[PDB]
Amino acid sequence: ELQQARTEVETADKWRLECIDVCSVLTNRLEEEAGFLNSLLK
Amino acid sequence: QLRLELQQARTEVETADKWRLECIDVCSVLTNRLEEEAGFLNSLLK
Amino acid sequence: GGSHDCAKVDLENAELRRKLIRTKRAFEDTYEKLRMANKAKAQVEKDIKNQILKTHNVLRNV
Amino acid sequence: SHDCAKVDLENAELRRKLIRTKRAFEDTYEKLRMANKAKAQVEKDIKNQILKTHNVLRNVRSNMEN
Ligand SMILES: [Zn+2]
């Protein structure tokens, strides 16, 4: 009855870490795009 | 083996889902901002 | 000065008048296009400032 | 009957104003050409950013829907 929950941590942390990856891609994208828009003013 | 068993569900079915729901919320607002900003750039092109 | 072909200089003066009008109107049209370009550029810069403020808000407040 | 001297002076003045106006038009047209070039470059970079964002979003859809 130990691995029945020790498997849910790998799946829950799988979806969580994948979400963190997507959040990293989106955050980096908004940073680069906002930097580009900032370059049109300089 | 009660401590080691219930210790698992304390975080992997709670905290790991807490930061996951906060995470998907962040991805939602960031996705919306990227969509409206891309739409703004397309509006500049047209 | 010397003599000239009177009718030819009259017709040439009329041609120069029409060419002057046309060239002047081309200048006015080009200047107007430049004015519209400057205005559109300024407005676009304003909108870009708004979008930079928006992304700044959604980035430094999350 | 047109007064030859006056008509010659008018010819000279018309050529002068014509050349002057042609040059003002040429300078304004050059400024507009530079503005259109800079705008073309800006629109090109904007197209680059739209390509990047579209690829990111489509990759998120291919990472979540499938
Ligand atoms: Zn004459």
Residue numbers in the entry:
A (entry chain D): 503 to 544
B (entry chain C): 499 to 544
C (entry chain B): 1079 to 1140
D (entry chain A): 1081 to 1146
What did the publication describing this PDB structure actually write?
In flies, Centrosomin (Cnn) forms a phosphorylation-dependent scaffold that recruits proteins to the mitotic centrosome, but how Cnn assembles into a scaffold is unclear. We show that scaffold assembly requires conserved leucine zipper (LZ) and Cnn-motif 2 (CM2) domains that co-assemble into a 2:2 complex in vitro. Purified CM2 forms a stable 2:2 tetramer with the purified LZ of the PReM domain, and we solve the crystal structure of the LZ:CM2 complex, revealing that helical dimers of LZ and CM2 interact in an anti-parallel fashion. Thus, Cnn molecules have an intrinsic ability to form large, LZ:CM2-interaction-dependent assemblies that are critical for mitotic centrosome assembly.
Most of these substitutions strongly perturbed the ability of the LZ to form a stable 2:2 tetramer with CM2, the only exception being L535E, which still formed a 2:2 tetramer but with reduced efficiency. The purified LZ-L535E protein exhibits reduced α helicity, suggesting that it is partially unfolded (red line), yet it can still interact with CM2. To better understand why the L535E substitution did not more strongly disrupt the LZ:CM2 interaction, we generated LZ-L535E:CM2 crystals and solved their structure. Perhaps surprisingly, LZ-L535E appeared to be folded normally and was largely helical within the crystal structure. Although L535 is packed within the core of the LZ:CM2 assembly, there is sufficient space in the core to accommodate the longer E535 side chain, and E535 also forms a hydrogen bond with the invariant CM2 T1133 residue in the core. This presumably explains why the L535E mutation only relatively mildly perturbs LZ:CM2 assembly in vitro and Cnn scaffold assembly in vivo.
